[PDB]
Write a protein that binds this ligand. Structure first.
Ligand SMILES: [Cl-]
Ligand SMILES: [Cl-]
Lengths: 188, 182
């Protein structure tokens, strides 16, 4: 059909639950999922990894791949989910540029959690190796105090609906309710 | 839709017309297009250039990115086009692995053209900012790329004389096979 496709943006600071949530949305809505960190990991596996500067350069490149791949999916009329710790200062204009070549209707989910919970997750994920080593995640005492005192990520000013999901206490999260929230908005 | 999605594979050696043709298929069928060269270009722009082994590594990584992206698109039930100079020895297994995690119905288009025309195109692309004598000799004498043994329909398109290519006919050839698999 001629309908404008939906672009579901899942954002949040690192460790706020955006990975799990975006994956649940992909399974629940049967939609393609483009994740910055997943793209970075494909690149670390193909080109190698080293230090934080390389991680940053690979991340900037992964973000470029995310927008490139999104455009061709949206141009086919298919909806999709994009997940990253999006930055208002740079991603607002990237989303505008995307919209110009591949029109979409935005739906945004922002994940948040307490500093203490975020610090616990960052540490355990790195200790238990759930996190790819190439990311070279800043895990020093200063880094963790910055994580702890950061507050919630600002959402992208895209228009359209926004849901904020606090994952501080995961037991309180009803994933199907979140999927249904998106479905209702896709239906409109 | 619950129909198995199609995976349209556009293969060919460099400069055989696989780029233009895959773009015509994407726009003509309104499907996503994943191109090895296009992914490589995004990576060179973000990471830079160096010795030609780097380009080789970037190429290998772009391919991995192609299969990564294809999987999620196919898993949603959406059909797509993948364009590359696919290699029988490595991409046969990668396509099998993809099928396991993201079932698809393959449709293949292989582009070919005379070596002389291929050299001309490559030289002009090199000259028009868009190649050793060994590189060019390999281009001229190499012969046609082997198609991937994936089953499904195969169409070979000889682009030595582009004026005689009916692009719509090719679109409808694929579209008829899509209707056949619905
Ligand atoms: Cl997360
Ligand atoms: Cl070409």
């Amino acid at each position: 059909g001629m309908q404008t496709p939906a672009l579901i943006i899942v954002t949040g600071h690192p460790a706020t639950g955006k990975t799990t949530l975006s994956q649940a949305l992909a399974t629940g809505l049967r939609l393609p999922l483009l994740s910055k960190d997943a793209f970075k990991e494909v690149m670390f596996d193909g080109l190698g990894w080293s230090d934080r500067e390389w991680s940053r350069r690979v991340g900037a490149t992964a973000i470029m791949m995310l927008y490139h791949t999104a455009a061709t999916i949206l141009q086919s009329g298919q909806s999709l989910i994009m997940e990253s710790n999006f930055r208002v200062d740079l991603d607002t204009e990237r989303m505008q540029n995307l919209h110009t070549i591949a029109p979409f209707t935005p739906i945004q989910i922002r994940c948040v959690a307490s500093g203490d919970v975020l610090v616990e997750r960052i540490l355990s994920r790195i200790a238990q190796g759930a996190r790819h080593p190439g990311h070279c995640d800043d895990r020093s005492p200063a880094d963790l105090e910055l994580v702890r005192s950061r507050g919630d990520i600002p959402p992208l000013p895209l228009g359209g609906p926004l849901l904020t999901v606090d994952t501080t206490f995961p037991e309180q999260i009803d994933m199907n309710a979140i999927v249904q929230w998106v479905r209702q908005h896709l239906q409109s």
